[PDB]
Design a protein around this ligand. Sequence first.
Ligand SMILES: [Zn+2]
Length: 257
Amino acid sequence: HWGYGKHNGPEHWHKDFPIAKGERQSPVDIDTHTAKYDPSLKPLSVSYDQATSLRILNNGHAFNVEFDDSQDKAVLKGGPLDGTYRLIQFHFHWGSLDGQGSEHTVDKKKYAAELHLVHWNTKYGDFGKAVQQPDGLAVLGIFLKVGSAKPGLQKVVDVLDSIKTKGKSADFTNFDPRGLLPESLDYWTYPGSLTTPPLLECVTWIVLKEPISVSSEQVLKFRKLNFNGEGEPEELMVDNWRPAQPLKNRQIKASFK
Ligand SMILES: [Zn+2]
């Protein structure tokens, strides 16, 4: 099945998921000179004070930090969005080396990693229904550069040993995702897709301009994870990013001047 190797990576996905060659695929390159400022865009409202993290899971493609999404406890609103989007999980994409790892690029620059906070539109009742709708999801994307450590990431880093291989989970309560955000909420936005199969075209992307800094030691720990299950040949979980896809008939809008 699908993955990030030579034989099963992004360049193969279209055979099982023909929407891979669709009109609104993600990620994309953000050309900062052609993204236009849209004064009609609102500030983003990120309301994470009541967020309830539950568990962390290695799904064989990344690790997900999962939230209780059975009530409006952590929500995204405003910005480009109409209505209320509930946080369900976050995860990262990262590289084998610090010079690659992000999915989106900025003027063809690749960051070391990219954080995706995934939210679903409450008007559709559940995640599974939301991903069938063109406005079903809102994903907040945050770039990671290597420099100073991110204190708010360390709790995630230190549990990774317990979820080394595919299918492992661990309790992960009381984690506050506010500690993963940069200072500024200035963003770019465009309509796109999930970046992993099934590649559904259901996402409003909100990509923050300001990266967070993580330390080399933090990223090194991500790269010790495994794609494989327990007692299988070890294949380090690295380079779990899809490259930029054609922009097609889309415009990228900026919230800032
Ligand atoms: Zn992602």
